[PDB]
Design an enzyme around this catalytic site. Structure first.
Site, mmCIF file in Angstrom:
data_model
loop_
_atom_site.group_PDB
_atom_site.id
_atom_site.type_symbol
_atom_site.label_atom_id
_atom_site.label_comp_id
_atom_site.label_asym_id
_atom_site.label_seq_id
_atom_site.Cartn_x
_atom_site.Cartn_y
_atom_site.Cartn_z
ATOM 1 N N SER A 260 -11.941 10.290 -4.439
ATOM 2 C CA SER A 260 -11.526 10.055 -3.060
ATOM 3 C C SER A 260 -10.005 9.884 -3.017
ATOM 4 O O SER A 260 -9.361 9.780 -4.063
ATOM 5 C CB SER A 260 -12.239 8.836 -2.461
ATOM 6 O OG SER A 260 -11.851 7.643 -3.124
ATOM 7 N N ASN B 35 -9.122 5.025 2.845
ATOM 8 C CA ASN B 35 -9.816 5.756 1.803
ATOM 9 C C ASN B 35 -10.769 6.780 2.402
ATOM 10 O O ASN B 35 -11.482 6.478 3.357
ATOM 11 C CB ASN B 35 -10.596 4.735 0.960
ATOM 12 C CG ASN B 35 -11.152 5.314 -0.317
ATOM 13 O OD1 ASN B 35 -11.294 6.526 -0.455
ATOM 14 N ND2 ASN B 35 -11.483 4.442 -1.265
ATOM 15 N N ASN C 285 -7.882 8.378 -5.956
ATOM 16 C CA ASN C 285 -8.679 7.352 -6.620
ATOM 17 C C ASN C 285 -9.494 7.948 -7.771
ATOM 18 O O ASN C 285 -9.796 9.147 -7.779
ATOM 19 C CB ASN C 285 -9.626 6.674 -5.615
ATOM 20 C CG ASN C 285 -8.886 6.032 -4.439
ATOM 21 O OD1 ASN C 285 -9.271 6.202 -3.275
ATOM 22 N ND2 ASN C 285 -7.835 5.285 -4.741
ATOM 23 N N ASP D 64 -12.512 7.952 -8.386
ATOM 24 C CA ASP D 64 -13.807 8.526 -8.003
ATOM 25 C C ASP D 64 -13.666 9.848 -7.252
ATOM 26 O O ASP D 64 -14.653 10.402 -6.775
ATOM 27 C CB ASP D 64 -14.614 7.528 -7.166
ATOM 28 C CG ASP D 64 -13.999 7.276 -5.799
ATOM 29 O OD1 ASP D 64 -12.865 7.731 -5.563
ATOM 30 O OD2 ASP D 64 -14.648 6.626 -4.961
ATOM 31 N N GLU E 165 0.820 -1.213 0.000
ATOM 32 C CA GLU E 165 0.000 0.000 0.000
ATOM 33 C C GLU E 165 0.859 1.270 0.000
ATOM 34 O O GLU E 165 0.579 2.222 -0.732
ATOM 35 C CB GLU E 165 -0.959 0.008 1.201
ATOM 36 C CG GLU E 165 -2.023 -1.083 1.142
ATOM 37 C CD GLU E 165 -3.063 -0.864 0.036
ATOM 38 O OE1 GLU E 165 -2.966 0.146 -0.686
ATOM 39 O OE2 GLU E 165 -3.975 -1.707 -0.107
HETATM 40 CL CL LIG Z 1 -10.083 13.201 -1.786
#
Ligand SMILES: [Cl-]
Ligand SMILES: [Cl-]
Ligand SMILES: [Cl-]
Ligand SMILES: [Cl-]
Ligand SMILES: [Cl-]
Ligand SMILES: [Cl-]
Ligand SMILES: [Cl-]
Ligand SMILES: [Cl-]
Ligand SMILES: [Cl-]
Ligand code: NA
Length: 129
Positions: free
Chosen positions: A50, A59, A46, A48, A35
């Site tokens: 996020s 997240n 990400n 989307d 990670e």
């Molecule tokens: Cl964000």
């Protein structure tokens, strides 16, 4: 802070992650490696909108507030920046909530793809624990 492998294993164990919800310490260290490469300051955006924060790339869609993820939740009740601290307490306490939420460590796609079913004990080999 960039942790050493055994240094992180020790901190994680101290904070109660070794066998938390049945996941041996090696699973957590392996997840952290892929990670974040053991870097508490790691962030990644990400698709989307996020963002993932810290050694376990938690997240902002569900778990922490960063003020820029529309329609998201803050289930760990923390600012996402708390997840970048050299002190891993916030990341650990939040990971405990995540791993308890139904899908175990599959919540971490990198764990599922790179650690799950592997010889994760190798990640804590030689460490004074
Ligand atoms: Cl964000
Ligand atoms: Cl750092
Ligand atoms: Cl390593
Ligand atoms: Cl292990
Ligand atoms: Cl970053
Ligand atoms: Cl937000
Ligand atoms: Cl919330
Ligand atoms: Cl906040
Ligand atoms: Cl499980
Ligand atoms: Na959020």
């Amino acid at each position: 802070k960039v942790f050493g492998r055994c240094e992180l294993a020790a901190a994680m164990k101290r904070h109660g992650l070794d066998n938390y919800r049945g996941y041996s310490l090696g699973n957590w260290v392996c997840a952290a490696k892929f990670e974040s490469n053991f870097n508490t300051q790691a962030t990644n955006r990400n698709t989307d909108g996020s963002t993932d924060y810290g050694i376990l790339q938690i997240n902002s869609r569900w778990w922490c507030n960063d003020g820029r993820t529309p329609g998201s939740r803050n289930l760990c009740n923390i600012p996402c920046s708390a997840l970048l601290s050299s002190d891993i307490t916030a990341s650990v306490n939040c990971a405990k909530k995540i791993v308890s939420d139904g899908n175990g460590m599959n919540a971490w796609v990198a764990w599922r793809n790179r650690c799950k079913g592997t010889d994760v004990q190798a990640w804590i080999r030689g460490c004074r624990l």
